[PDB]
């Protein structure tokens, strides 16, 4: 299932937030070579949806993601910030562009995953990263919601 992705994805091995200096720059990296590994499994499954990147200091995400849907692509900005108690807290993905048009989500644009996820990630600190929330978070919404946005007349190719 899901779950196999998150096999094939390297955990992160330093607890450190954003804001520790010397050890969030060897977090980031982990971090970077974490997300490089995951495109590569999904450009080898055939499954490449997403880019991420950060400013310099890893504070601030953005990127986007896509889904195709009857061979159509359609994709979507993304973004993010760190806070300042990651990686025990798992960040808010965020979509702007779909902002108000699916109950299923937050003000501004905020992803909000199924109740079972936020136990999951904190049972796993600091083993899971960005890769992981990507897997586990944007991923799963963007499957289910995309195809049932588009069916309902929501959102169109462009």
């Given at each position: 299932?899901?779950?196999?992705?998150?096999?094939?994805?390297?955990?992160?091995?330093?607890?450190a937030?954003?804001?520790?200096?010397?050890?969030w720059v060897?977090?980031?990296?982990?971090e970077?070579?974490?997300?490089?590994?995951?495109?590569?499994?999904?450009?080898?499954?055939?499954?490449?949806?997403f880019?991420?990147?950060?400013?310099?200091?890893?504070?601030?995400?953005?990127?986007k993601?896509?889904?195709?849907?009857?061979?159509?692509?359609?994709?979507?900005?993304?973004?993010?910030?760190?806070p300042?108690?990651?990686?025990?807290?798992?960040?808010e993905?965020?979509?702007?562009?779909?902002?108000?048009?699916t109950?299923?989500?937050?003000?501004?644009?905020?992803?909000?995953?199924?109740?079972?996820?936020?136990?999951?990630?904190?049972?796993?600190?600091?083993?899971f990263?960005?890769?992981?929330?990507?897997?586990?978070?944007?991923?799963?919404?963007?499957?289910?919601?995309?195809?049932?946005?588009?069916?309902?007349?929501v959102?169109?190719?462009?």
């Amino acid at each position: 299932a899901t779950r196999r992705v998150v096999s094939e994805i390297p955990v992160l091995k330093t607890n450190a937030g954003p804001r520790d200096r010397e050890l969030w720059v060897q977090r980031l990296k982990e971090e970077y070579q974490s997300l490089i590994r995951y495109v590569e499994n999904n450009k080898n499954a055939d499954n490449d949806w997403f880019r991420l990147e950060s400013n310099k200091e890893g504070t601030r995400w953005f990127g986007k993601c896509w889904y195709i849907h009857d061979l159509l692509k359609y994709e979507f900005d993304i973004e993010f910030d760190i806070p300042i108690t990651y990686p025990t807290t798992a960040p808010e993905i965020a979509v702007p562009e779909l902002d108000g048009k699916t109950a299923k989500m937050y003000r501004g644009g905020k992803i909000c995953l199924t109740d079972h996820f936020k136990p999951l990630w904190a049972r796993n600190v600091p083993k899971f990263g960005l890769a992981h929330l990507m897997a586990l978070g944007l991923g799963p919404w963007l499957a289910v919601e995309i195809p049932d946005l588009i069916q309902k007349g929501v959102i169109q190719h462009k």
